[PDB]
């Protein structure tokens, strides 16, 4: 996994430092040491064997880059050709505008789980990053129905700017 998932230094791990009287064997390491030879040692060999067959018949794929294909403000009314491209250009970003929001969600939960009862003042960095997102999201895509087409988003963005230059008049 890439280094964009805030994997903050993975162990701040503690150390084994016993202090009982007439010290006992701990069932964790008395058993997990009995675990990394019996089911990890097989399964580590198997995938170690799966890998070498994959590089025999190795196969590649790619990402399918895309283009700008001008958006709607350059585009003509009625002319279905242009708009259709720009339209399926926008719904083509409506996902990528929204799979991001899946990542922050995905990132906004794992924070406090790797912080437990700290939970705040160590996830504000991630939480401030969230309101920052959600505010543009709603300001992009809130009032819309399910027939969301770029002519509506474009109007939503255009009703808004009027107040942005109507409230700058007093």
């Amino acid at each position: 996994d890439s280094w964009d998932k805030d994997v903050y230094p993975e162990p701040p791990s503690r150390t084994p430092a016993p202090s009982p009287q007439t010290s006992l064997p701990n069932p964790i390491t008395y058993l997990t040491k009995a675990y990394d030879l019996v089911v990890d040692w097989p399964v580590t060999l198997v995938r170690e064997f799966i890998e070498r067959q994959h590089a025999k018949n190795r196969t590649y794929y790619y990402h399918r880059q895309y283009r700008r294909v001008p958006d709607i403000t350059e585009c003509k009314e009625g002319d279905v050709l242009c708009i259709y491209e720009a339209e399926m250009q926008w719904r083509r970003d409506f996902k990528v505008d929204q799979e991001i929001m899946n990542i922050i969600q995905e990132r906004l939960k794992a924070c406090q789980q790797r912080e437990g009862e700290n939970y705040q003042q160590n996830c504000a960095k991630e939480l401030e990053q969230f309101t920052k997102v959600t505010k543009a999201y709603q300001d992009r895509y809130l009032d819309l129905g399910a027939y969301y087409s770029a002519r509506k988003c474009l109007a939503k963005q255009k009703q808004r700017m009027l107040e942005e230059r109507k409230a700058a008049r007093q």
């Binding site: 994959h54 196969t59 794929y61 790619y62």
Partner: protein
């Protein structure tokens, strides 16, 4: 009721075992391709974008 389940359980195995066994073997040997970046202009062959092997085989013969 028993005859039935004995038949339901069978004719699904009749094609489930050729598949499930067969589909374990493909992933074992091969499959699960990897990312890659375009060679500065290559015109990928329409299934150089999808991962799973059989899935980028169906896409060759069809679609």
């Amino acid at each position: 009721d028993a005859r039935f389940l004995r038949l339901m359980k069978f004719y699904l195995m009749l094609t489930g075992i050729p598949v499930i066994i067969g589909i374990t073997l493909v992933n074992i040997f091969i499959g699960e391709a990897e990312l890659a970046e375009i060679p500065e202009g290559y015109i990928p062959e329409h299934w150089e974008y999808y991962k799973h092997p059989i899935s980028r085989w169906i896409a060759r013969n069809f679609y």
